[PDB]
RNA sequence: AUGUCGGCUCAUCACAUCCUGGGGCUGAAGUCGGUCCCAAGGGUAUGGCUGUUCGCCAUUUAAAGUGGUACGCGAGCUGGGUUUAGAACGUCGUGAGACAGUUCGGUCCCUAUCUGCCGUGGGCGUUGGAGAAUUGAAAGGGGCUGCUCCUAGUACGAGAGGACCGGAGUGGACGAACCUCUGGUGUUCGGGUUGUGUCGCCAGACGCAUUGCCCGGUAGCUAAGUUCGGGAUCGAUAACCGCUGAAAGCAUCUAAGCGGGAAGCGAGCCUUGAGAUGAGUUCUCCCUGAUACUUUAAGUAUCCUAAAGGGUUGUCGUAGACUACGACGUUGAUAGGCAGGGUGUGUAAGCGUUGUGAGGCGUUGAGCUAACCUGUACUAAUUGCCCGUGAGGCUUAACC
RNA sequence: AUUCCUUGUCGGGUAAGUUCCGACCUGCACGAAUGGCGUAAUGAUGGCCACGCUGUCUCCACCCGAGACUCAGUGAAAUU
RNA sequence: AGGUGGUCGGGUAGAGAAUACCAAGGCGCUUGAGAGAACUCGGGUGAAGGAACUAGGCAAAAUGGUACCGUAACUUCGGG
RNA sequence: AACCGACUAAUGUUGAAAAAUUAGCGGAUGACUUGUGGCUAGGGGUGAAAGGCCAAUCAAACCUGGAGAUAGCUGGUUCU
């Protein structure tokens, strides 16, 4: 349940440490991004020599959230902190080459298959 | 309701291992990756248990790849294939949500050790 | 906030058409023959024919 | 369309073998018995009237009791009517059971919604609240303007205001049937059904099917 | 054009003396 | 909405209600019959009749429980020595409310409430 | 004494249409566009800056329409700007002062009578009365739309690219019902703990300190949760396209005649609905007494009767401001209690044991446990009183 | 606290800054005790930014009380 | 529910005449009783987010003690 | 802290109150604050200066008198 101004950790090695959702993309008046949802983000804090710099506006896919995800048996998976993976703003393909921390099977699909392949865990 | 009770007790799992808050459990969770059906193990501490017949649940908190993860399971769901209690914990409370704010040494639970 | 025209006696009367009072449900005690609010004890302390106070 | 008159028992779930939970409302359909057949010749339309359940004999008026006696059904908890459209022929006393919905994939359920009493425009109509601070004087959950000055100089009919909420006939549409239990006279219907437990519900095959 | 008016007294009720 | 909720506020805080009912129970145990307002009588049953049940089993634990709920040693003794023994066989309904008209001063609906099977 | 800018809240209408739908022309290959015609059903950004409206910018969206409504809306809110009194800068003036310049600061009242509107009752009526079930004249609600896949890398195109038509899926926003789940709340449940006071003391409790603080949490309510909705279809149409066809030997969609044709229109879906005084329909139930009197009526009076049923009273409710509505009222589970269970809390007290002691351990998952579940007449639900009558005018027709 | 044109221009800060900070000087209309320019400390002073914090807001939900509602007693008001 | 000079000031805790709970002593504030709608007032909690609110973080939330450690620019050498 | 004050907000605005309450806020050995009594008086006083204050009144107090000022203005002006 990410919205404009929400800060997210970077689950990637793109060079962002912290990003801020600028826009929930998708529909008119769409309030919230969930896991799987692409958001426009601004890089608020980045590592010294990385692919992305402070202030770089780009896309990102939310991969972990405190609100988490309901599964069809009624289960719910919640993460301690909100994270995302920066994507090329045109191609929507991950900037980084390594994912940090678990992800969910909600990313499973054609779009974010690389993320799922690289993630240390998929819950 | 006797009607709802009859309907619920037909669906209830027969033999579930006794676990308690503070236990370290390993839940074997049924995952289906396209066609293939495997078991995936969720190992962590029981921090909460809802006793509500078929509506029973339990929350397990693990720290995975540097990330806190909690999962509320529905005990009687088919998806939960098995629960193994690895360690019995000694706690003084029903719900260990205080563990959300602890880490490492602070997050350790005492063994019950009959 | 306030009327622009004093209200007639007629319309005042029309408003108070619902202001009439309704009487209490009474009954008579079997033993004491004393009228009482139905379901309530009498003044002499009977209720449904027995002295209860 | 023909339907049944159930009582909402409560909600529950049905675990599928594939580890999907299904939120179900359990409707108990005690055998419905036809108490009057209305025809075009007698009544100007084709319908059945059905009763369900039982009423304490003591609680049944003479007018009510004669109507049931004429059908040769025992008094039930009320009377509900189902229009017929297919030229379907029922007789009085004829029972209707949950087994009606053995082929039915989706039904339309109708009950009386729970009553929320007098409710303000914020809850009743999803009005936005006004500012909680920043100067607002006694007007936090106030409904705002209710019109538009000299023209038209009046409040338009149907203007959303505070008032009684709930306790109204409501029909949900296209609720899936998860299970018909003929033994226990149950329908398990996916999702929410109007009103509280114990309320009468009319179940009918879905009109938009 | 709209000429900003002075329609009301500068001190407002309930103090308006 | 108050759907399915229990307990009257009686135009009081919680701490006041708790105090008031503790008092009122002590009065009812002591005098075996008490005139109150009818809504207070109806609430009092949910306070007194559980004290009487507790008093049916005599234990240091139960006396202390009763003391906690009444803070009266005369009441606790009467509960465990008299009222428990009296109501031993009886399965609930230790009290009886008799409606008794209106109070003069405020025309409040009043009622007597009494213990059942008073020796008097 | 008709409050004046902007915002907020809440809107309502027009159509000169922003999107979505239907079309003609195109300098329309396709994909896109342009332009015009039809169309007002629904829909129609959030932020940065500024008091701003606006605008610029960032990032969205199918789209971010243009207007009217006292430049809609201050007895609905705000009061940043304008609008007083203070003070200062620039400037003008010898000066008091001034500026359509700037700057800092600077009290926004009203318990709603009437109309109106949202709700919710009471009265009477609807022609004997009563209990039900209904018909539908009428009205209201709803009406949005993205992306993906298939059709198909097909049609089209040198290529790059890339469809119509049709079908399937999954969203956004909006709405609804609901509480099984996920959660919130939970001063009515359980516990820990600080200070203090008290219960003679110890032990154990209780009061008070924001529920003292802290941790959980039942029921209910509830959204972030769950589920469902928008339609299809029929009919009539708009622009538009025709068929046949003269006037006008031809031609011509039109004059006669017959078609196609829109998110729009009438139905279709949901809700209300016979105060629809045009007061409807159906089913069932109840009342088949005397007399006198008159200026003889649909008359009056007395007596006898007091029905079906309605109320008042009572126990109450997932119903409720009051009402109303609904359940129950002993031929009884309506409420409370009580039993058993569940749930929650988390191993009571006492006693024993261990330790110098704080404390640990056993008894013990103990004790306590609200609004829950199943039961249970233990307590409380009194046919007492009212009200409602006594076969229901007349005319005409047809039937007997 | 002065600049009209004007949101001057450039730089910083922000995804985006008519405000803010630095700077430029075509100062409409600064300027030296109506003091000029600085200035540590101080300020319920003006502007701006950041962290923390949050029901301020997305977008409200629930709960505790006092009113509101009902009964009984008392009993105004502007207005007309 | 305002204002009004002086005197006296117990216990536990506490630096204290603060504060909490009490003593001595004094009071329950001269309408009550119900109910548990909207909305108003005064409070409590809040998923995810965290100033996106707004003229403006207004209001709330937050911080909060003692001892020790440690503490920058700048400075009028005191400070800060 | 007392005491003196009055920066913000909310309430209140036919108030509990003709300026308060609640939560916060400033000063708190001093150009402090307070009691009692004195003195200054209306074109006069007094003013760390707001045209502030001088008895809920102030760009000239209040009372009485001149006085029925004056009012080219407004209202009103009575039977057939």
Automatic annotation (TrEMBL), chain A:
Coiled-coil ranges per UniProt: none
SUPFAM superfamilies (UniProt xref): Ribosomal protein L14
A GO term for molecular function: large ribosomal subunit rRNA binding
This protein's record includes keyword Repeat: no
Biological process, per Gene Ontology: translation
Matching PANTHER family: 50S/60S RIBOSOMAL PROTEIN L14/L23, LARGE RIBOSOMAL SUBUNIT PROTEIN UL14M
Subunit field text: Part of the 50S ribosomal subunit. Forms a cluster with proteins L3 and L19. In the 70S ribosome, L14 and L19 interact and together make contacts with the 16S rRNA in bridges B5 and B8.
Record-given protein name: Large ribosomal subunit protein uL14
Organism encoding this protein: Vibrio natriegens NBRC 15636 = ATCC 14048 = DSM 759
Gene that encodes the chain: rplN
From TrEMBL, chain C:
InterPro entries: Ribosomal_bL32 (IPR002677), Ribosomal_bL32_bact (IPR044957), Ribosomal_zn-bd (IPR011332)
GO biological process: one example: translation
Taxonomic superkingdom: Bacteria
Spans annotated as Disordered: 1-27
Gene Ontology cellular component list: large ribosomal subunit
Keyword check for Acetylation: no
UniProt keyword Ribosomal protein present: yes
UniProt GO molecular function: structural constituent of ribosome
Keywords from the UniProt entry: Ribonucleoprotein, Ribosomal protein
Record Pfam families: Ribosomal_L32p
Biased composition (Basic residues): 1-15
Record-linked NCBIfam families: rpmF_bact
Family: Belongs to the bacterial ribosomal protein bL32 family.
Protein name in the entry: Large ribosomal subunit protein bL32
TrEMBL record, chain D:
UniProt entry tagged with the keyword RNA-binding: yes
Post-translational modification note: Methylated by PrmB.
PROSITE patterns to which the protein is assigned, alphabetical: RIBOSOMAL_L3 (PS00474)
A molecular-function term among this protein's GO annotations: rRNA binding
Membrane-crossing residue ranges in chain numbering: none
GO cellular component: cytosolic large ribosomal subunit
Alphabetical list of SUPFAM superfamilies matching this protein: Translation proteins
Cross-referenced InterPro entries: Ribosomal_uL3 (IPR000597), Ribosomal_uL3_bac/org-type (IPR019927), Ribosomal_uL3_CS (IPR019926), Transl_B-barrel_sf (IPR009000)
GO biological process, one term: translation
Keywords noted in UniProt: Methylation, Ribonucleoprotein, Ribosomal protein, RNA-binding, rRNA-binding
Pfam families: Ribosomal_L3 (PF00297)
PANTHER family xrefs: 50S RIBOSOMAL PROTEIN L3, LARGE RIBOSOMAL SUBUNIT PROTEIN UL3C
Subunit architecture: Part of the 50S ribosomal subunit. Forms a cluster with proteins L14 and L19.
Function: One of the primary rRNA binding proteins, it binds directly near the 3'-end of the 23S rRNA, where it nucleates assembly of the 50S subunit.
Name the record gives this protein: Large ribosomal subunit protein uL3
Source organism of the structure: Vibrio natriegens NBRC 15636 = ATCC 14048 = DSM 759
TrEMBL record, chain F:
Matching Gene3D superfamilies: Ribosomal protein L17
A Pfam short name: Ribosomal_L17
Organism superkingdom: Bacteria
BP term (GO), one: translation
UniProt KW keywords: Ribonucleoprotein, Ribosomal protein
InterPro entries on file: Ribosomal_bL17, Ribosomal_bL17_CS, Ribosomal_bL17_sf
Gene Ontology cellular component annotations, sorted alphabetically: cytosolic large ribosomal subunit
GO molecular function, one term: structural constituent of ribosome
Similarity comment text for this entry: Belongs to the bacterial ribosomal protein bL17 family.
Subunit structure as annotated in this protein's UniProt entry: Part of the 50S ribosomal subunit. Contacts protein L32.
Name assigned to this protein: Large ribosomal subunit protein bL17
Gene designation: rplQ
């Amino acid at each position: 349940m990410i919205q404009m101004q929400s800060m997210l950790d970077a689950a990637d090695n793109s060079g962002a440490r912290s990003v801020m959702c600028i826009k929930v993309l998708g529909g008119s008046h769409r309030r919230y991004a969930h896991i799987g949802d692409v958001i426009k983000v601004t890089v608020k804090e980045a590592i010294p020599r990385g692919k992305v710099k402070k202030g770089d506006v780009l896309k990102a896919v939310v991969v972990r959230t405190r609100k988490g995800v309901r599964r069809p048996d009624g289960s719910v998976i919640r993460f301690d902190r909100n994270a995302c993976v920066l994507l090329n703003d045109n191609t929507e393909q991950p900037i980084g080459t390594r994912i940090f921390g678990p992800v969910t099977r909600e990313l499973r699909g054609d779009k974010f298959m690389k993320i799922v392949s690289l993630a240390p865990e998929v819950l | 309701s006797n009607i709802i009770k009859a309907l619920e007790e037909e669906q209830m799992k027969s033999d579930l291992p006794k676990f308690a808050p503070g236990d370290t459990v390993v839940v074997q969770v049924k995952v289906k990756e396209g066609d293939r059906e495997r078991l995936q193990a969720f190992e962590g501490v029981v921090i909460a248990i809802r006793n509500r017949g078929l509506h029973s649940a339990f929350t397990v908190r693990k720290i995975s790849n540097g990330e806190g993860v909690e999962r509320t399971f529905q005990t009687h769901s088919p998806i939960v294939d098995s629960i193994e209690v690895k360690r019995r914990g000694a706690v003084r409370r029903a719900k260990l949500y205080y563990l959300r704010e602890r880490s490492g040494k602070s997050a350790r639970i005492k063994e019950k050790l009959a | 906030a306030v009327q622009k025209n004093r209200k007639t006696r007629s319309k005042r009367g029309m408003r108070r058409s619902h202001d009439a009072l309704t009487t209490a449900a009474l009954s008579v005690d079997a033993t004491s023959g004393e009228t009482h609010l139905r379901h309530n004890v009498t003044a002499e302390g009977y209720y449904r024919g027995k002295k209860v106070i | 369309m023909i339907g049944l008159i159930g009582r909402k028992v409560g909600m529950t779930r049905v675990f599928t073998e594939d580890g999907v939970s299904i939120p179900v409302t359990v409707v108990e359909v005690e055998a419905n018995r036809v108490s009057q057949v209305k025809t075009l010749e007698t009544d100007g339309y084709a319908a059945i009237q059905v009763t369900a359940g039982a009423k304490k004999a003591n609680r049944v008026n003479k007018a009510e009791a004669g109507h049931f006696a004429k059908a040769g059904v025992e008094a039930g908890r009320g009377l509900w009517e189902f229009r017929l459209e297919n030229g379907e022929e029922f007789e009085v006393g004829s029972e209707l059971t949950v087994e009606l919905f053995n082929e039915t994939k989706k039904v339309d359920v109708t009950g009386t919604s729970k009553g929320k009493g007098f409710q303000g425009a914020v809850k009743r109509w999803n009005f936005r609240t006004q500012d909680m601070t920043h100067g607002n004087s006694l007007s936090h959950r106030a409904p705002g303007s209710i019109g538009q000055c000299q023209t038209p100089g009046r409040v338009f009919k149907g203007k959303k205001m505070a008032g009684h909420m709930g306790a109204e006939r409501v029909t949900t549409q296209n609720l899936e049937i998860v299970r018909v239990d003929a033994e226990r006279n149950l329908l398990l219907i996916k999702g929410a059904v109007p009103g509280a437990t114990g309320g009468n519900v009319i179940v009918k095959p879905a009109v938009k099917a | 054009r709209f000429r900003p008016p002075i329609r009301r007294p500068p001190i407002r009720p309930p103090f308006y003396p | 909405m108050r759907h399915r909720k229990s307990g009257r506020q009686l135009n009081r805080n919680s701490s006041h209600r708790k105090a008031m009912f503790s008092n009122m129970a002590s009065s009812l145990v002591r005098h075996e019959v008490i005139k109150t307002t009818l809504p207070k009588a109806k609430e009092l049953r949910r306070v007194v009749e559980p004290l009487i049940t507790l008093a049916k089993t005599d234990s240091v634990a139960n006396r202390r429980l009763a003391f906690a709920r009444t803070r009266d040693n005369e009441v606790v003794a009467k509960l465990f020595n008299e009222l428990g023994p009296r109501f031993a066989a009886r399965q609930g309904g230790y009290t009886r409310i008799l409606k008794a008209g209106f109070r003069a001063g405020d025309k409040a609906p009043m009622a007597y409430i009494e213990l059942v099977d008073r020796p008097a």
